[PDB]
Amino acid sequence: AIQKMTRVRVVDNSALGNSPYHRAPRCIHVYKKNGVGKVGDQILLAIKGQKKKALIVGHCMPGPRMTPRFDSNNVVLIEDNGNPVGTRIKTPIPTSLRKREGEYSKVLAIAQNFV
Amino acid sequence: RFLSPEFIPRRGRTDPLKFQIERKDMLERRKVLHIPEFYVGSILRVTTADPYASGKISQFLGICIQRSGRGLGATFILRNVIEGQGVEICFELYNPRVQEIQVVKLEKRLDDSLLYLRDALPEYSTFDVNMKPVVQEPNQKVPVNELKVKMKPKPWSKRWERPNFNIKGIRFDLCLTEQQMKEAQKWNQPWLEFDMMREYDTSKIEAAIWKEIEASK
Amino acid sequence: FKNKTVLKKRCKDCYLVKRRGRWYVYCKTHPRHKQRQ
Amino acid sequence: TVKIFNITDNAAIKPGTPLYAAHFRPGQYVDVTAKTIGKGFQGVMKRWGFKGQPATHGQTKTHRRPGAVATGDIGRVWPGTKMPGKMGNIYRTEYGLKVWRINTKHNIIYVNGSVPGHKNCLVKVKDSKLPAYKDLGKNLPFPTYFPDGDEEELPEDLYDENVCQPGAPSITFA
Amino acid sequence: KFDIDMMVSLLRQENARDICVIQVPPEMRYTDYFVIVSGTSTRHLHAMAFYVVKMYKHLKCKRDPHVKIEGKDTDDWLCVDFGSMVIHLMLPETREIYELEKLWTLRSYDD
Amino acid sequence: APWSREAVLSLYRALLRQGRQLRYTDRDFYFASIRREFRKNQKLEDAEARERQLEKGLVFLNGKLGRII
Amino acid sequence: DYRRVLVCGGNGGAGASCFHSEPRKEFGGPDGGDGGNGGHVILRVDQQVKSLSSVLSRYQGFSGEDGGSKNCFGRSGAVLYIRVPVGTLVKEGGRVVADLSCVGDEYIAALGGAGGKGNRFFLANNNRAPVTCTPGQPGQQRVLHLEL
RNA sequence: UCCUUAAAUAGGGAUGGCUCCACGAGGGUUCAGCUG
RNA sequence: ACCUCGAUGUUGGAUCAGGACAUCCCGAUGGUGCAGCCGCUAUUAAAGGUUCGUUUGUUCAACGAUUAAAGUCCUACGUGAUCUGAGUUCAGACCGGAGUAAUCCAGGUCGGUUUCUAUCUACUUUAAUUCCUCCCUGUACGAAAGGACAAGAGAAAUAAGG
Ligand SMILES: [Mg+2]
Ligand SMILES: [Mg+2]
Ligand SMILES: [Mg+2]
Ligand SMILES: [Mg+2]
Ligand SMILES: [Mg+2]
Ligand SMILES: [Mg+2]
Ligand SMILES: [Mg+2]
Ligand SMILES: [Mg+2]
Ligand SMILES: [Mg+2]
Ligand SMILES: [Mg+2]
Ligand SMILES: [Mg+2]
Ligand SMILES: [Mg+2]
Ligand SMILES: [Mg+2]
Ligand SMILES: [Mg+2]
Ligand SMILES: [Mg+2]
Ligand SMILES: [Mg+2]
Ligand SMILES: [Mg+2]
Ligand SMILES: [Zn+2]
C-alpha cells in the first residue's frame, strides 16, 4: 500500500531514478479513488524536484496468497502516455501484473526477472 | 510421526464435524499432491501453475519462515532474495494450483517463526535458486540448525528482543546493549509459562486425527 | 423549448396549443420557435 | 427454532416431513437469514463508523464520542439518529449466495461467502429472491428432495461445475 | 485457429516494415511467442494493430477472452497481449532505444 | 584479446547458419541486427570485455534463453 | 479560411469595503476582501479542428468575483481556452500575435484584469480605518483575425 | 527577484552603522530519523 | 434598538450533520450558430454523491495533484453542558505612532485557567452508487480528423449490511 508521502524505490534503468538527490522519491498522488496504491496502480512521484508518473511493481504490504511480498516499495517510472522512462527493470516483477486491468505489457517487456 | 500442523485444530467452540469434513478434503487432496514433511526453517521449492500464463509452471525456492493457518486454508510463507530484492510468498498448501512441493533441505530452526529474517542480514535469507536437494537418512531425527543470525541496525519490523517473541536464533549481544536487554526484560511475564489453564493439550485430538489418516490410507 | 411568460408566434407555421395545462408554441418548420408558457 | 417460509400452494408439504441438504443443488443461489453476532452496547465509533475525534492536539475527554447530535434550531433529536446502543443480535439476510456443493451424507450445504451469525447458530436458508434468480427453480426438487423416492441415490458430494474438486489432478491453465 | 502463423501472415499482408519473432522458453512465465514489429508511423501502427485485433476477434476462440490494445495514447509504441503471444508494435527509434531483442534473447547478458 | 581469435568468427558463422533457416522473422533485419551487434562494438574493446561479449553471443547462439524463429 | 472573432478578457472583481466587529472588539478594523483577478483567455491549436467554420461570437473570459466580508477574497475568473486548427495565423489589426502550428500550441489572447483591493489591503499602522475600495481593473479586449 | 516545496500569506538571501563568542524549557524554519 | 447585560465571548477547525433547489456530478428531455464528439442554452429531477495537500488562525484565496463532480445556500454566519483556543478578547512585554505625562492605539510580535455528577423533553437497529476496460465497434456519423448510441460482460472503488 503506497499512499501519499511514502518513500518509494525506483527499480528502473532511468537517469531520474538512478541519479542521487538529497530527497528520496515520494509519492505525491495515487491514481486511485482511495489513495491506496497496490501493484499495478499508478502514482505521481516527486523525483529530483520533478513530478513524474510511475507504476507500482511491488510493496511490503502483504497481498493475496500466492503473490510476492517485497522488502521495498518498488516503482517503475512511466511517461504520461505510458512508455516506461527506463529501458530495463532489474529486480523481480510479479507475474500477477499481466492479468490486471490496465496496460502492463511494456513494463513486462522491460522486466528481466519475474516472481 | 510428523502430524502436519494444519490438521491439529486451534481450540474453539467450532463443531468437530467441521474438522472431520475439512480433514477429509485435505487428505483426499494429499492423495493427489504429496505434501512432504517440513518445518519452519527448511528450504522448499514450490512449483505452481500460473493462471496468468497458459498452463505454465512457476518455481519459487525459499526458506519456510512461517507455518500458519489450519485446515484446508493452511499456508506456509517462505522467503528469499532475488537480485538483492527480498521476496516472500505465502503459499496455500491445498491450493489446486500448486503442482509440487519439494523439501530441498529439511531442517528445523531454533525458532518456530523466522519472521526476524526480514531484519537479519540479507545473507541469512539468500538461497541459491538452483541448489540441489540434500538427502536425509530414512531413520533420522530432523536436524536442528542452531544458527544464530546477525541483525541489521536496531530499527526493526518487530521488537524481536522482547520476551513475548521468545526468539532464540538472534545474536542479540552483538546488536543490543546490556541496558537494552535489561529494558526489554520489563515485559517478561514469568507467570505466563506457569498458568496451567492456558496450555492446549492436543494428545487425544492428535490420536483421533492419526486414526482418521490411517483409515484414509 | 424556451420559457416565455408571453407566447408569440414567429413564423407562419408556429401554432399555439394548450397541452398538459399550459400553452405552447409548436412549429414544424422551425423547431427553434418552440415556446412554453 | 421454527421459521416460517412463504410458499405457493403447489409446494405444500405435509407436516412432519424431513428436509435434507439435497433440497438445494449446486449452482443454485440462496438467501441466508440469521441473528448477527451480538456485540452488546457499543459506542458510536464501532456501531456506526463515526470518525471520532483526534487523539492529541488538546482534545479533552472526547476521542470516541458522537459530535453534535443535531442542529440547534430543531431543539430535539430526530428519530433514527445514530447513537450508541446495542449492536448486533438482530436478524439480517445475505442475498444471492451461490451453493457451491452439497454433502448429502452429512447434509452440508456449502454457501458462497459469509453468513450472518456465529458458528453453531441456526440460519434460515431459502431460494434466493433476487430477480436474476427468479425462475431457476425448474430443475430443483420442487416440493423438496425425497430420499425415500430413491429415483437415483445421490453421490456423497454434489459439486458445482466450476469447483476444483479435491482429488482431481492438479489444475493446469492450459 | 489463431496462431503465430496467422500473426505473421497478417503482418506481412499489411506489410510491416520489419518483423521479428522470439520463441520464449516455457520456464519464463510470460508467453510463447514475442513478436516485435516496426512501422512507418503511428497511423500505420494503429491500423495494423486494429487489423490484427479484428482478425483475432473474428477468427476463432470464442471461449478465449477478448484482448486489450495497449499504447493507444502513445504514438511510438503499441502492444497487444494475446493468450500465448505478445506483439510489440513500434517505430525504429523506439525499437533501437529499447533493444527488446537483446532483452528477450539475452535475459541477463546485456545492459 | 578474446577467448580465441577464431571463436568470434566461428560464432558469427554459426549465427548466419542458424539464420539460413529463419522462417517467421525478417531475414534482412536479422542480418542487419547481427551486423550492428558485431560491428558497432567488436572493434576496440578492452581485453576484458571480450570474454563477456563472446559469452553472451554464445548464449544467444544456444537460444535456451529465447531463440529467434 | 479567414475569420474575425472578438475576445474579451475577464474583468477583475471589485474589492470590498467592510469593517469587522465582534463581541469583545467592537472596532475590529477593515474587513474587506480583495477582488479576484479576471480570467485569462487563450487560443489553443487542435489537429481535430479543420478550419474556422466552428467559430463563434465574443469569447468572454470569466470575471473574478468581488471581495467579501471577513476578508474573504474573490475567486479568480476561470481560464477560457479557445481552440483552432493547426497552422493558424492569429493577427490583431495588422500586428501578428502568433503563428500557431504545433498540436496544443497555446497563446494568451486577452489577459484578465487584476482584482480590486479591499479596504483591509490599505490597513497599516498609519491607516487604521481605510474605506478605499479599488475596483477591478478591466481585462484586455480585442478583435482577432484568424487565417489558415 | 532568487533558494527552499509538487504546491511556500511560512523560512532564508539578494552619536549612528555594524560585529551573535557563548548561553536560552525564548520565538521561528529545516535535513534525517522516529513514531497510532 | 424590539427580546436577552441576576455566568451564554467570537472566528475558524474537529464530530455529526437536518433541510432548500436557485443542480456541481449522476438521470430524462426541447433547442442550437448540435454532421459525430463536443460544447452553449432551457425544462424536469434533491434518491445518491459532492477529494487530498503547501502557505496562512483563517473562513475565502492562490498554488499542486485529482475527480463524474469538487454546487449555491439556510440551520443562533447549525453544532464549545461534544471537542479545540490558532486569530481576536483579560492581567506581562516589545516595535511603530499619538500624548507634557498618565496612558492610549480598528496596527505588527511573543505569552496567556475553556467548569458542569443530565432532573425534564427529544433521541439511542427506518430494493446501492459511480467510474473504467471490453462487446456492440475505429460500427453509426463524418471528406477526413475524429468518434456514438442504446444493450451486455468484466474489473475495481466507495457506501450499506455481515
Ligand atoms: Mg524544486
Ligand atoms: Mg512495521
Ligand atoms: Mg481516530
Ligand atoms: Mg484524552
Ligand atoms: Mg508548516
Ligand atoms: Mg536561564
Ligand atoms: Mg424607540
Ligand atoms: Mg436567569
Ligand atoms: Mg429545478
Ligand atoms: Mg444571518
Ligand atoms: Mg490565543
Ligand atoms: Mg498588553
Ligand atoms: Mg494586536
Ligand atoms: Mg499570539
Ligand atoms: Mg510558554
Ligand atoms: Mg468543555
Ligand atoms: Mg455527560
Ligand atoms: Zn415557426
Q: How many residues does chain E have?
A: 111
How close is the Cα of C5 to the center of ligand 9, in Å? 17
Instruction: Cell numbers for G22, please give them.
Output: 465582534
Q: Residues G78, G41: contact at Cβ < 8 Å?
A: no
Q: How far is CA A3 from CA A27, A28, A30, A59, B158, in A?
A: 7, 8, 6, 11, 22
Please tell me the distance from the alpha carbon of residue B124 to that of residue B114, in angstroms, as a whole number: 10
- Confirm if B18 and D103 have CB atoms less than 8 A apart: no
Sequence-ordered list of residues with C-beta below 8 angstroms from that of D77, at least 6 positions apart, any chain: D69, D70
Residue C24 near residue C35 (C-beta atoms within 8 A): yes
Cβ-count burial D68-93 (b if 16+ within 10 Å, e if not): eeeeeeeeeeeeeeeebeebbeeeee
Q: Cell for G19?
A: 469593517
Q: Is the minimum distance from the CB of A22 to strand H below 7 Å?
A: yes
CB of residue A67 closer than 7 A to nucleic acid strand H? Answer: no
Distances from the Cα of G68 to the Cα of A93, E57, F56, G19, angstroms: 55, 61, 73, 11
Which amino acid does the sequence have at D4? I
> Distance between CA atoms of F66 and E23, rounded to whole angstroms?
5
Alpha carbon of D46 to those of D37, D51, D52, D88: distances in Å? 14, 10, 10, 11
Identify the bridge partners of residue D126 per DSSP, sorted by sequence position. D31
Q: Give the strands of the sheet with G41-46, arranged side by side.
A: G80-85, G41-46, G106-110
Q: Residue A72: which of A19, A2, A8 has the closest Cα?
A: A8
- Backbone phi, psi, residue G92, to 5°: -90, -160
Tell me the chain E residues in contact with residue A114 when contact means C-beta distances shorter than 8 Å: 28-30
What gap in Å lies between CA E13 and CA E54, rounded to an integer? 14
C-alpha cell at A37: 496504491
Q: Is the CB of D51 under 7 A from strand H?
A: no
**Closest residue, by C-alpha, to the C1' of I39:** G54
* CB contact set of E63 (below 8 Å; sequence gap of 6+): none
- For chain D, what is the radius of gyration of the CA atoms? 23
Report phi then psi at A18, rounded to 5.
Answer: -90, -5
- Lookup: nucleotide whose C1' is closest to A25 CA: H6
Identity (one letter) of the amino acid at F11?
L
- Beta bridge partner(s), residue B68: B75
What is the rounded CA–CA span in Å between residue D55 and residue E49? Answer: 57
For A7, the domain range is: 1-115
Do residues D139 and D25 lie in contact, with contact meaning Cβ atoms separated by under 8 Å? yes
Q: How far apart are CA E104 and CA E89, in angstroms?
A: 15
Q: How far is the CA of D71 from the C1' of I20 (A)?
A: 16
User: In F, which residues are within 8 Å of E104 by CB distance?
Assistant: 66
Q: By three-state DSSP, how is residue B21 classified?
A: helix
Q: What is the CA radius of gyration of chain F?
A: 12
Beta bridge partners of A37: A2
Classified as helix, coil or strand, E57 is helix
> Is the shortest CB-to-strand distance from G25 to strand I under 7 Å?
yes
The x, y and z cell numbers of residue G2, run together, are 479567414
Nearest chain A Cα distance for residue B89, angstroms: 5
Q: How many Å apart are CA D8 and CA D10, to the nearest integer?
A: 5
Are G74 and G41 contacting, i.e. CB atoms less than 8 angstroms apart?
A: no
Measured between beta carbons, the chain B residues lying within 8 angstroms of A99 are 51-52
Q: How far out from the chain centre does Cα D132 lie?
A: 18
Q: How far is D168 from chain B (nearest CA, A)?
A: 7
Resolution (angstroms) stands at 2.5
Is it the case that chain B and chain A have 3 or more CB pairs lying under 8 Å apart? yes
Angle at A77 between CA A75 and CA A78, to 5 degrees: 130
Separation of G61 CA from ligand 9 center, angstroms?
27
Please state at what angle helix B203-216 crosses helix B16-30, rounded to 10 degrees.
40
Domain ranges for chain F, please list them: 1-69
List residues bridging with A74 in a β-sheet: A9, A58
Nearest CA-CA distance, residue E94 and chain F, Å: 15
- Residue A38's Cβ-side half-sphere holds a number of Cα atoms within 13 Å equal to 14
CA dihedral D72, D77, D78, D83 (to 10 degrees): 120
- Gap from CA of F23 to ligand 6 centroid (Å): 89
DSSP one-letter code for B196: G
Give me the phi and psi of B76, to 5 degrees please.
-135, 130
Cβ contacts of residue G87 below 8 Å, gap of 6+? G99, G100, G101, G148
Phi/psi at F19 (5° precision):
-75, -20
In the structure grid, which three cell numbers stand for residue A92, read together? Answer: 523481480
Per DSSP (E only), the strands in D50-171 are 85-87, 91-103, 108-111, 124-127, 157-159
B36 CB contacts (<8 Å, ≥6 apart)?
A: B101, B102, B103, B106
Residues 6+ apart with CB under 8 A from D7: none
Residue of B nearest to A66 (CA): B91
Give dist(CA E107, CA A85) in Å, integer. Answer: 20
How close, in Å, is residue B59 to chain A by CA atoms?
9
D55 touches strand H (CB under 7 A): yes
- Chain position carrying cell 453534535: D68
- Do the Cβ atoms of D95 and D130 come closer than 8 Å? yes
| Residues present in chain F in total | 69
Q: Is the CB of A1 under 7 A from strand H?
A: no
Q: E99: which residues sit within 8 A by CB, 6+ positions away? A: A87, E110
Residue A24, CB, strand H, below 7 Å: yes
Spatial CA neighbour of B102 closest among B193, B172, B37: B37
Q: Which of D118, D77, D95 shows the shortest CA–CA distance to D29?
A: D95
DSSP B155: -
How far apart CA B142 and CA B174 sit, in angstroms, is 29
One-letter amino acid at D23 equals: H
b/e per residue, C5-24, with b = 16+ CB within 10 A?
Answer: eeeeeeeeebeeeeeeeeeb
Residue whose C-alpha cell is 509452471: B57
The pairing of strands G59-60 and G2-8 is parallel
What lies within 8 Å, CB to CB, of B107 at 6+ separation is B39, B41, B42, B43, B142, B143, B144, B145
- Report how many domains make up chain A: 1
Q: How far apart are CA B98 and CA B92, in angstroms?
A: 8
Coil, helix or strand at residue C31: helix
**Partners for D (CB, 8 Å, 3+ pairs)?**
B
Cell triple for F40: 558497432
Which experimental approach was used here? cryo-EM
> Identity (one letter) of the amino acid at A32?
K
How many angstroms is C1' of I101 away from CA of G71? Answer: 38
- How many Cα atoms sit within 13 Å of C10 on the Cβ side? 13
Assess contact for D171 and B33: CB atoms under 8 A: no
Contact G131, G11 (CB under 8 A): no
Element (H, E) at A106: helix A105-110
The residue behind cell 479560411 is G1
Residue E100 in contact with partner chain F when CB distance is under 8 A: no
User: What is the crossing angle of helices F27-39 and F5-20, to 10°?
Assistant: 170
Interface contact E110, partner F, CB < 8 A: yes
| Amino acid identity at D150 | D
CB contact under 8 A, A91 and B82: yes
- Tell me if B96 and D164 make a contact (CB, 8 A cut-off): yes
Nearest to A39 by CA among A9, A17, A59, A13: A59
Phi and psi of D124, rounded to 5°?
-90, 125
SS3 readout for chain G: CEEEEEEECCCCCCCCCCEEEECCEEEEEECCCCCCCCCCEEEEEECCCCCCCCCCCCEECCCCCCCCCCCCCCCCCCCEEEEEECCEEEECCCCEEEEECCCCCEEEEECCCCCCCCHHHHCCCCCCCCCCCCCCCCCCEEEEEEEC
User: Domain segments of chain B: what residues?
Assistant: 1-217
Q: Do the strands C2-3 and B85-92 form a parallel or antiparallel pair, or are they unpaired? A: unpaired
Q: Alpha helix (H) ranges present in chain B?
A: 16-30, 172-175, 178-184, 203-216
B78 HSE (CA, 13 A, CB side): 27
Distance of CA B14 to the CA centre of its chain: 24
Q: Which residues surround ligand 1, an ion (CB under 5 A)?
A: A 49
Q: What is the rounded CA–CA span in Å between residue B183 and residue B170?
A: 17
Task: Answer whether A96 touches B (CB < 8 Å).
Answer: yes
Cell numbers that stand for G97 in this block: 500575435
